[model samples]
Target: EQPRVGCGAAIVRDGRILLIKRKRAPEAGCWGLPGGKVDWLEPVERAVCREIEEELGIALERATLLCVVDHIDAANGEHWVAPVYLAHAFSGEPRVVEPDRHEALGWFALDDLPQPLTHATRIALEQVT
Candidate 1:
């Protein structure tokens, strides 16, 4: 079977996009949208919502489906098919709920994304722009 795939969601508001600094692998210390691996039987929308809540303490109402991107890294023998989502509205102020697994959380304007985003995250943002 192919390696288990995952999804990510980009929640934007007032010219700022939500981002999390990872405190664990596969890209520890790098910035990215809030997301993780999909559970065996979970739907994509549900998974995205759960991840956002767990990582950022925000409740999202599944907005729009963005785009799916394929990432292949031959050097590490790793590949992923990530479905990205765009969430415009959500409940609660964004905060770093999982501080142990994330160094910080903040909203960054699209034109001023944080430096050194994870590889896949950089690609996903480019797709949106």
Candidate 2:
């Protein structure tokens, strides 16, 4: 498949979006918004929420569709059409629940974001303003 669909979130709070460091390949150790593979049978909304919960250890109290991104690359075997969401509300503090996939997690201001950002993260953030 050229573009396997995935989903991630831009969890905004106090003027910052949540971020996590990748612990595995396909951008290993790179900082980006938390998101990954979307099952064909899963609703995009539910899928993104579930991914956040599994990786960030919190539930989205409220969210809205942000954007859908096409991250296509041939040589790297990296192709994902991920739908990003803007989480306006949520319950509980976000944490690194899945340590195997993510090494670190935290919220960051857009202008002060960390290095090695993913293409998907750019697509999500560029639309904001």
Candidate 3:
């Protein structure tokens, strides 16, 4: 199988970024940006916004491209081409809407992020800091 295109939202407020803990594979139990794979023919920014709403129960008002990164693990047969966006404009407080997929949600300062971030999140953080 080939790599899939995914998108993530880095929601910012008061110098913190919102993140979630994954509850399933493809980086299970790791803290990472909230997002999912891009739907067929969906715009990358739209995908990011949609994923945030689906996972966090909020609406993303803006999705500014922060970086596009590749996460590849040949031995594990994992690869993803993902776009990470810096979103500051949004409505409603972020909450865990999909309990099956996410275990927790929180805001973190750039230097104070949670441990064991997914590969994509780690790469994305490199761009942010």
Candidate 4:
């Protein structure tokens, strides 16, 4: 199976993380970091930055790549390779720019995050927290 490239970042401010409720496949209805597929010819850092903006409606000023994430599940025929990061800061308030694909946007304490976070998000959090 071919794995699509994706990115997610633990956008942080004031000791909290920005989480967006995914409304699409692979992890629909789950709270997770701002992440989406890389676009054609996009620069490495700018790619993730663009995804975060398209998904969360805000722009990240900085993000540090922390680890690799692979969502491989042959049984369900779902696969994705994601680079997760720890963002130092961002600009503007988070909003649901793509409501059809995502719902709710808020900052959460790492210790008291929204429930039902995706496996990818949980894996991503262990590194930064």
lDDT of each: 0.84, 0.85, 0.86, 0.82
- CA deviation > 4 Å runs, candidate 3: none
Tens digits of per-residue lDDT for model 1, 1-129: 376678899888897888889988777889888888888899988888988888888899856888876767777678887788998899998888977899988889889888889876787788777
TM-score, model 2 to reference = 0.94
RMSD of each: 1.5, 1.2, 1.1, 1.4
lDDT of 3: 0.86
TM-score of each: 0.91, 0.94, 0.94, 0.91
For residues 9-125, could you state the per-residue lDDT of candidate 3 as single tens digits? 777789888889999987899998888899999988889888888899899885789988788889889788888898888898889998898898888998888998988788887
In terms of TM-score, how similar is model 1 to the real structure? 0.91
Clashes of each: 0, 1, 0, 0
